[PDB]
Design a protein around this nucleic acid. Sequence first.
RNA 1: UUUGCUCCACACAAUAUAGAUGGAUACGAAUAAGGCGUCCUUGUGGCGUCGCUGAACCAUAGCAGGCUAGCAACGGUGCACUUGGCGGAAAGGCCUUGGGUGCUUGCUGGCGAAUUGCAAUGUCAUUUUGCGUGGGGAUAAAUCAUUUGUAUACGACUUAGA
RNA 2: GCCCUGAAAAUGGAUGGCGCUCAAGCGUGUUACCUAUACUCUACCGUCAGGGUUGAUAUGAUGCCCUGACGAGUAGGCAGGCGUGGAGGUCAGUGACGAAGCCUAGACCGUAAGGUCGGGUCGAACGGCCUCUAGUGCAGAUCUUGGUGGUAGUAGCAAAUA
RNA 3: AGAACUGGCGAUGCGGGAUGAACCGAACGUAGAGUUAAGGUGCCGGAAUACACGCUCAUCAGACACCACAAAAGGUGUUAG
RNA 4: GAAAUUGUUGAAAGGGAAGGGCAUUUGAUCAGA
Lengths: 197, 127, 61, 172, 48, 106
Amino acid sequence: VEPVVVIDGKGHLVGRLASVVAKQLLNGQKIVVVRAEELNISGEFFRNKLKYHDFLRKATAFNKTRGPFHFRAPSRIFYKALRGMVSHKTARGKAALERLKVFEGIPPPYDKKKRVVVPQALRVLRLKPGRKYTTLGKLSTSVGWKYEDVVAKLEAKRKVSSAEYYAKKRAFTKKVASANATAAESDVAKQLAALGY
Amino acid sequence: ASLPHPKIVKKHTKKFKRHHSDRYHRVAENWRKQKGIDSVVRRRFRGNISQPKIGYGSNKKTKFLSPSGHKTFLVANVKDLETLTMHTKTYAAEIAHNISAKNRVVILARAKALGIKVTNPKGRLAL
Amino acid sequence: GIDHTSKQHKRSGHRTAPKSDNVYLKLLVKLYTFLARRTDAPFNKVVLKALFLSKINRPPV
Amino acid sequence: MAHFKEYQVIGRRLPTESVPEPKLFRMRIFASNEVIAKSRYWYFLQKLHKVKKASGEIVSINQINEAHPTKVKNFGVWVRYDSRSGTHNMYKEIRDVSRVAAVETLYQDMAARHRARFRSIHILKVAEIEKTADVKRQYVKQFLTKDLKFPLPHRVQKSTKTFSYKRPSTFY
Amino acid sequence: SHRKYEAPRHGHLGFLPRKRAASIRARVKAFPKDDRSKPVALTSFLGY
Amino acid sequence: AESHRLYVKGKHLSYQRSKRVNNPNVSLIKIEGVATPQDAQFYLGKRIAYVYRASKEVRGSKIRVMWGKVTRTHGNSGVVRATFRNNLPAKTFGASVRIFLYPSNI
RNA sequence: UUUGCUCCACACAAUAUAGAUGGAUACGAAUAAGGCGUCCUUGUGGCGUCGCUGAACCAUAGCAGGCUAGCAACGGUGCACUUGGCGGAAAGGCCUUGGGUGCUUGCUGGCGAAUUGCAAUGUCAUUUUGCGUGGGGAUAAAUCAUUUGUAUACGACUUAGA
RNA sequence: GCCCUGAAAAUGGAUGGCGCUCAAGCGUGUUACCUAUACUCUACCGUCAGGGUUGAUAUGAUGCCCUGACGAGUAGGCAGGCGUGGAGGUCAGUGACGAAGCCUAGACCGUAAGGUCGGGUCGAACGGCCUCUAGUGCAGAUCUUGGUGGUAGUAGCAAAUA
RNA sequence: AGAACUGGCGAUGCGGGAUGAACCGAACGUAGAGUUAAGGUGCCGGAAUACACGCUCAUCAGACACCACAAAAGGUGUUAG
RNA sequence: GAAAUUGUUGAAAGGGAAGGGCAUUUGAUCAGA
Ligand SMILES: [K+]
Ligand SMILES: [Mg+2]
Ligand SMILES: [Mg+2]
Ligand SMILES: [Mg+2]
Ligand SMILES: [Mg+2]
Ligand SMILES: [Mg+2]
Ligand SMILES: [Mg+2]
Ligand SMILES: [Mg+2]
Ligand SMILES: [Mg+2]
Ligand SMILES: [Mg+2]
Ligand SMILES: [Mg+2]
Ligand SMILES: [Mg+2]
Ligand SMILES: [Mg+2]
Ligand SMILES: [Mg+2]
Ligand SMILES: [Mg+2]
Ligand SMILES: [Mg+2]
Ligand SMILES: [Mg+2]
Ligand SMILES: [Mg+2]
Ligand SMILES: [Mg+2]
Ligand SMILES: [Mg+2]
Ligand SMILES: [Mg+2]
Ligand SMILES: [Mg+2]
Ligand SMILES: [Mg+2]
Ligand SMILES: [Mg+2]
Ligand SMILES: [Mg+2]
Ligand SMILES: [Mg+2]
Ligand SMILES: [Mg+2]
Ligand SMILES: [Mg+2]
Ligand SMILES: [Mg+2]
Ligand SMILES: [Mg+2]
């Protein structure tokens, strides 16, 4: 319904999230994924590290620069899942993948925009409690991503700024809800209530 | 003005070009049926050219009809043309390729007099 | 798909006209075709069939 | 093989001049329809007596409805089933409101825990345990304590829409 | 079949490609870790 | 007002297809706000326009229209089948279409 | 540079569109827990309340939205200015000040619309580019050739030369 | 029962891939839904079969028309047609006011073999129909003759002192 | 490697088994509509991230017949007897 | 005065071939009433 849908990837079950995003992309919706480092994979961290090492040992024998590239960043791991689920060798798949942006953290353009979640991909809703899971930032750091610390620092800064913004917004919302509390027994408000508003 | 006819349906309008006539110059486009034992076209594998078959045959009611609803009749002179005087709504005259320009003028004038349609009235005109 | 119990598009195997191009024989066949159709006469039907027969099927009498 | 109904099936071992009025054998067959009910009847009668469908007849078939479909009961169920390596008898207890629901739960449970398909299971007996403290399986007994209450922690509501705007909660 | 006699491989695969450096001045690709208690000083010098 | 729209937004998803064979004669349309075939029954028969722009002005406009109509529901999730006078180009997989409210039975 | 280049505004032309058709509407964390409000003894505190989806919220009436007359209230909103601040992860945005000006459907009137003929996207968006009219601004390099040998098969590299 | 140990091979790699853990896994049950050249209905083509109609203006009775069914195919058989050189007849056919030939992401007819037309080029003959006849149809045969490419401005044009 | 009966492939496209002569489904004139077969319905990919009861956590999990493998023997792992 | 092959001009397309089938967009072009 929006021109751009911004998904907060935190705790979003990378494969299920990639399925949702791939279908949206192919249907024609622009998707921006933020906080890719906070994405989750089901299974133990050691399981997923071993899986990525099995991925890492695959490479073109006669020239490793031709073989499958092993992107270490969480955003690029998510992008790998999503690309594997898009028909990326066609022009249609290329257009779909151009309709997508993935980020670690929440960069400036999208830090002041609304973020959504995908309930059918959310870890807390999908995984049975007690099941172990991996965090993409930790997996990526373990397999060679160099910027977990920088992203964490920038995220702490962004969260300070956003908490200040939200304190201001909550104050204003209290003001508005109070001014709406009065004029709730007025004739116009009672007609609105009769009509369902 | 031709006889009324049902809407003309061409079941297959694109030419049946011979297999590999796009691949080799020596292979002409004139349709030839593949006789090869392994021929993917003869075996009719999905994705290959279609072959002419009787199912493509056109409705007998509209067969041989030009888009205007007339059947073409080749005419070489005024006598050939006048074989169509009582059939102007069914047949249209086509002047033969080898008719000279002055004979074409004569034929056109006579066809106009007889209300017989000519399919190629602009052949060998005054340049 | 149909499990055909017999040969499809099988011709009857009987002559329906003379192989001959004799115009007079064809006129006789036309006459006896009319008769066999519009008389209900077994004779007319069998004569129409006999008019189609080849030479070795019409031995001299 | 589907949602079950219970049928009484009565068959005859068809009469002759020697034996008129044969001995009218009856069975309670859990089946999803009457064709299967009669098939199972003949299967078990051929396991039991010298008779077959061609030498007998189905005297009657009648669905048996639960007499009290809206009271919770504890059922003891005795089954005989074939594993991959042998045949075994088993006793289980199922809490439900009807024999058909108990038997459906039993078939699901045998498939789930022993990979015993329908064809591999015989329902030896289904009987309501009238007296609690004769319930001998803890997974049923735990539901018979006084004033039984329990929460349903971690509620997961399904979204009608792809995207949500709220970061939902699992409270209940 | 196997090599039939073991020898170490010839050359170092970590110094690939054996191509011309993109500049006549070699890039410093890592500077010393900063210790921010010391005074301000250059971490390198240029010479001939 | 700011809004002037009298059509329901839709998306051209794909052609009718099996795994490896598509059928350009039938397009699949996701109608916004329709999640069941029961809801899509309302839009069965409604006219659809794919509206696109061209460089060459033709008959007084640089906007061209491909008309079609909803024919039946598709699947379990509100997608519908649609047929157009000329089949949609298939570069429009993911492009927006307009499902008008006529022919109306309200 | 046979009057070049660039920036702003305006008009006229082309050029296309992976696809606008009211608004991408910003805490963070947890989920065997939270949000909000309030209170105190400011806490891993007390009390109240809410969720059970955005089915929300905001916006939304007027020749695709005309021209006018009032009432009420000093609100809302567009615009060009203007004050100060914050924002570097890709900041290119967020907030804020004062005056001006337009609209206001918060309420009450007056006039207009037709004939696109019973529908036909019935054209209202943004992407580049070009040209013309004004106004502001700037006034180089690279390559070849020669040369060097820290280089070199040739290209390339590294040098020098008013 | 499921899971684990048992369980070691050579380029890097395969539940098809991604990925999936109250599954998108396993066992089982219920519905909804997707789509084959299959099934059902209809149209059209052809084939076969059964029929109607020589009572006239009525020229296609091998015709016209009605009804039903059917249609895969190598090797192979048969049928109906398309095209070529030459021959008898005919159209008192075409033609220096332009025959034949050739070129032509121009048009028309035929399911097709093919046929026809327009435009350009050209210069002396040629065609429709009914029949006759054959040295009558090419993608291949390391086919024959001739011509022409990519390789390619490539290999190279460096022995015999200059 | 060799026999029996049948059905196929050869001689056969089409939907399915990713892929494949033979397997599953179904055999084929040209089209339109509807319904299906076998197979499927997270995304690739048309089609329920359907509904229901359980089982399983694998530091080599498992994931549909032909078919592209695994055994004996073991485990207070866990489940049911 | 054909074709192979080639030059020039014009048009168009072009991420490890090209060519093809079904369908439609776009551009160019064109017959029919
Ligand atoms: K050719
Ligand atoms: Mg590295
Ligand atoms: Mg044709
Ligand atoms: Mg073969
Ligand atoms: Mg060795
Ligand atoms: Mg194992
Ligand atoms: Mg699947
Ligand atoms: Mg299952
Ligand atoms: Mg069909
Ligand atoms: Mg007949
Ligand atoms: Mg045949
Ligand atoms: Mg000869
Ligand atoms: Mg000529
Ligand atoms: Mg040509
Ligand atoms: Mg001469
Ligand atoms: Mg010969
Ligand atoms: Mg040849
Ligand atoms: Mg050959
Ligand atoms: Mg040769
Ligand atoms: Mg030669
Ligand atoms: Mg040389
Ligand atoms: Mg030499
Ligand atoms: Mg020498
Ligand atoms: Mg053979
Ligand atoms: Mg077969
Ligand atoms: Mg397989
Ligand atoms: Mg789908
Ligand atoms: Mg064992
Ligand atoms: Mg010459
Ligand atoms: Mg040429």
